Design an enzyme around this catalytic site. Structure first.
Site, short mmCIF file in Angstrom:
data_model
loop_
_atom_site.label_atom_id
_atom_site.label_comp_id
_atom_site.label_asym_id
_atom_site.label_seq_id
_atom_site.Cartn_x
_atom_site.Cartn_y
_atom_site.Cartn_z
N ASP A 1 0.89 -1.21 0.17
CA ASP A 1 0.03 0.00 -0.08
C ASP A 1 0.88 1.16 0.05
OD1 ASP A 1 -2.81 1.10 0.42
OD2 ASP A 1 -1.69 2.25 1.88
N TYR B 156 3.05 9.94 0.32
CA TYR B 156 3.90 9.49 1.41
C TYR B 156 5.21 9.92 1.12
CZ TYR B 156 -0.14 6.63 2.74
OH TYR B 156 -1.47 6.16 3.21
N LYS C 284 -2.66 5.87 -4.52
CA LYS C 284 -3.76 6.83 -4.11
C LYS C 284 -3.62 8.43 -4.88
CE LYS C 284 -4.06 4.47 0.25
NZ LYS C 284 -2.42 4.46 0.61
N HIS D 217 -7.74 9.47 -2.54
CA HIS D 217 -7.22 9.03 -1.23
C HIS D 217 -8.11 9.48 -0.08
CE1 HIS D 217 -2.90 8.93 0.77
NE2 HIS D 217 -3.94 8.57 1.51
N1 LIG Z 1 -5.99 5.98 3.21
C1 LIG Z 1 -5.65 6.58 4.01
O1 LIG Z 1 -5.89 7.76 4.21
C2 LIG Z 1 -4.45 6.08 4.97
C3 LIG Z 1 -4.31 6.59 6.22
C4 LIG Z 1 -3.53 6.05 7.07
C5 LIG Z 1 -2.77 5.00 6.99
N2 LIG Z 1 -3.05 4.27 5.61
C6 LIG Z 1 -2.41 3.24 5.06
O2 LIG Z 1 -2.38 2.19 6.19
C7 LIG Z 1 -0.94 1.76 6.66
C8 LIG Z 1 -1.12 1.06 8.18
O3 LIG Z 1 -1.26 2.43 9.05
P1 LIG Z 1 -0.47 3.19 9.99
O4 LIG Z 1 0.82 3.50 9.27
O5 LIG Z 1 -0.96 4.68 10.37
O6 LIG Z 1 0.03 2.70 11.32
P2 LIG Z 1 -0.15 0.92 11.80
O7 LIG Z 1 0.27 0.09 10.71
O8 LIG Z 1 -1.30 0.67 12.65
O9 LIG Z 1 1.31 0.97 12.83
C9 LIG Z 1 2.20 1.37 12.38
C10 LIG Z 1 3.22 1.37 13.58
O10 LIG Z 1 3.07 0.12 14.33
C11 LIG Z 1 4.44 -0.36 14.49
N3 LIG Z 1 4.62 -1.66 14.44
C12 LIG Z 1 4.54 -2.52 13.28
N4 LIG Z 1 4.38 -3.62 13.51
C13 LIG Z 1 4.43 -3.83 14.95
C14 LIG Z 1 4.56 -4.98 15.57
N5 LIG Z 1 4.56 -6.20 15.37
N6 LIG Z 1 4.87 -4.82 17.11
C15 LIG Z 1 4.86 -3.60 17.75
N7 LIG Z 1 4.74 -2.39 16.98
C16 LIG Z 1 4.78 -2.54 15.29
C17 LIG Z 1 5.37 0.33 13.60
O11 LIG Z 1 6.69 0.51 13.87
P3 LIG Z 1 7.99 0.07 12.75
O12 LIG Z 1 7.48 0.62 11.56
O13 LIG Z 1 9.07 1.16 13.68
O14 LIG Z 1 8.28 -1.20 12.90
C18 LIG Z 1 4.87 1.87 13.42
O15 LIG Z 1 5.07 2.71 14.37
C19 LIG Z 1 -0.18 3.03 6.28
O16 LIG Z 1 1.25 2.98 6.48
C20 LIG Z 1 -0.64 3.54 4.90
O17 LIG Z 1 -0.26 2.39 4.04
C21 LIG Z 1 -3.80 4.76 4.61
O1 LIG Z 2 -3.53 10.45 4.32
C1 LIG Z 2 -3.02 9.35 4.91
O2 LIG Z 2 -2.93 8.38 4.20
C2 LIG Z 2 -2.33 9.50 6.21
C3 LIG Z 2 -2.35 10.84 6.40
N1 LIG Z 2 -3.00 11.45 7.45
N2 LIG Z 2 -3.25 12.62 7.79
C4 LIG Z 2 -4.25 12.99 8.61
C5 LIG Z 2 -5.20 13.45 7.64
N3 LIG Z 2 -6.89 13.81 7.80
C6 LIG Z 2 -7.29 14.23 6.53
C7 LIG Z 2 -8.51 14.41 6.52
C8 LIG Z 2 -9.13 15.01 5.28
C9 LIG Z 2 -10.58 15.20 4.91
F1 LIG Z 2 -11.09 14.40 4.13
F2 LIG Z 2 -11.14 14.77 6.26
F3 LIG Z 2 -10.84 16.53 4.84
C10 LIG Z 2 -8.43 15.01 4.15
C11 LIG Z 2 -7.07 14.80 4.04
C12 LIG Z 2 -6.63 14.34 5.35
S1 LIG Z 2 -4.97 13.81 5.59
C13 LIG Z 2 -2.27 13.54 7.48
O3 LIG Z 2 -2.17 14.60 7.89
C14 LIG Z 2 -1.05 13.04 6.51
C15 LIG Z 2 -0.06 13.92 6.16
C16 LIG Z 2 0.81 13.52 5.26
C17 LIG Z 2 0.80 12.11 4.96
C18 LIG Z 2 -0.19 11.28 5.25
C19 LIG Z 2 -1.17 11.66 5.99
#
Ligand SMILES: NC(=O)c1ccc[n+]([C@@H]2O[C@H](COP(=O)([O-])OP(=O)(O)OC[C@H]3O[C@@H](n4cnc5c(N)ncnc54)[C@H](OP(=O)(O)O)[C@@H]3O)[C@@H](O)[C@H]2O)c1
Ligand SMILES: O=C(O)Cc1nn(Cc2nc3cc(C(F)(F)F)ccc3s2)c(=O)c2ccccc12
EC number: 1.1.1.21
Length: 315
Positions: free
Chosen positions: A43, A48, A77, A110
């Site tokens: 992902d 990012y 995204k 996104h």
């Molecule tokens: N669509 C969107 O708006 C959106 C928003 C947020 C996230 N996402 C995606 O979802 C992914 C996952 O979410 P996230 O990055 O927010 O957080 P997450 O996956 O919930 O947590 C990542 C954190 O957990 C730690 N970690 C990972 N595996 C671990 C384990 N086995 N034990 C203990 N700690 C562990 C990592 O540390 P280390 O890396 O130091 O190991 C990092 O600090 C993102 O990276 C991104 O690809 C999408």
């Molecule tokens: O985006 C990621 O994947 C992780 C993500 N999340 N957020 C919190 C956010 N909250 C939002 C709320 C809206 C809203 F739609 F609600 F207006 C729009 C956009 C965002 S960004 C961040 O501020 C961010 C900044 C840099 C890179 C990744 C991120």
């Protein structure tokens, strides 16, 4: 079962590697390790600021013949500053070029909110409010459908869309492709029963992000709840002889969700994949569901006046 069938006829691995906050000097080795130990879904996102380096890993493992392209499922995204119909192809091709790919398996809107186009990912007025773009979700969707019809992406979806926004796309005049996926925040403190059932009812696969509660989110505060340290989840892990993270990853898997935990730690990348050899009980599932507190990692204050802000709505 390791993959879920999407409404475009393709199969998506239910476990992916997240890359938000993976430092650019560490994400190449992180993605190489992940592929070596089994991951086949990565992902990604332009915002990012690490797609180039993710791409280096993907391309090396392809060149090394560790995996074939068809066996990978690469997601990225469209960032908020590129919702204008005229910017979408470019934004996708920048991601494809960076990732060293000729197509994406899935390309997501996104966030439902369009922001003013420019160099800035989060253009703000002098009072700190995000500056919207006048684009709407349906015109952006048509632009996403064109990417399918040009062969640059195999599937399109949405992310952070609430149920009324999902329904707006589904009822869009002249809708050509339904969204394949809705990628939303989901973990035992934000269980999303309502949004998930709607999406699944519609054949839309849900991907759960921040499944560990994003301990490295840069805005973390001491008083925030902490999934990994919650003794209640810890106890469920101990009963299964698994880590807390492993329980938190297997939990969405048993809700028929895709889950994308992030790490750049090789041991944790491996640990995180070892979740297909145990089962949470029904009771475990309902117990974890009970921890809901409508707690969000991702909901930036500066965006809350946007017309399309998704999180005022109940769903
Ligand atoms: N669509 C969107 O708006 C959106 C928003 C947020 C996230 N996402 C995606 O979802 C992914 C996952 O979410 P996230 O990055 O927010 O957080 P997450 O996956 O919930 O947590 C990542 C954190 O957990 C730690 N970690 C990972 N595996 C671990 C384990 N086995 N034990 C203990 N700690 C562990 C990592 O540390 P280390 O890396 O130091 O190991 C990092 O600090 C993102 O990276 C991104 O690809 C999408
Ligand atoms: O985006 C990621 O994947 C992780 C993500 N999340 N957020 C919190 C956010 N909250 C939002 C709320 C809206 C809203 F739609 F609600 F207006 C729009 C956009 C965002 S960004 C961040 O501020 C961010 C900044 C840099 C890179 C990744 C991120």
């Amino acid at each position: 079962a390791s993959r879920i069938l999407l409404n475009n006829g393709a199969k998506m691995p239910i476990l992916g590697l997240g890359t938000w906050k993976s430092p650019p000097g560490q994400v190449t080795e992180a993605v190489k390790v992940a592929i070596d130990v089994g991951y086949r879904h990565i992902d990604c996102a332009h915002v990012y600021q690490n797609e180039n380096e993710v791409g280096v890993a993907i391309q090396e493992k392809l060149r090394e013949q560790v995996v074939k392209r068809e066996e990978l499922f690469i997601v990225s995204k469209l960032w908020c500053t590129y919702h204008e119909k005229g910017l979408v192809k470019g934004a996708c091709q920048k991601t494809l070029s960076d990732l060293k790919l000729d197509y994406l398996d899935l390309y997501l809107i996104h966030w439902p909110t369009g922001f003013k186009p420019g160099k800035e990912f989060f253009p703000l007025d002098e009072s700190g409010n995000v500056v919207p773009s006048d684009t709407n979700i349906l015109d952006t969707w048509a632009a996403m459908e064109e990417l399918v019809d040009e062969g640059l992406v195999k599937a399109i979806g949405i992310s952070n869309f609430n149920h009324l926004q999902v329904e707006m796309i589904l009822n869009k005049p002249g809708l050509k492709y339904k969204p394949a996926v809705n990628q939303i925040e989901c973990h035992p403190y934000l269980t999303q029963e309502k949004l998930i059932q709607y999406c699944q009812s519609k054949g839309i696969v849900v991907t759960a992000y921040s499944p560990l509660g994003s301990p490295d989110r840069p805005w973390a505060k001491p008083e925030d709840p902490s999934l990994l340290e919650d003794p209640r989840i810890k106890a469920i892990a101990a009963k299964h002889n698994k880590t807390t993270a492993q329980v938190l990853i297997r939990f969405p898997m048993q809700r028929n969700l895709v889950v994308i935990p992030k790490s750049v730690t090789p041991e944790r990348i491996a640990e995180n994949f070892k979740v297909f050899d145990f089962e949470l009980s029904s009771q475990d599932m309902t117990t974890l569901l009970s921890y809901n507190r409508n707690w969000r990692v991702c909901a930036l204050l500066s965006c809350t006046s946007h017309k399309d802000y998704p999180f005022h709505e109940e769903f």
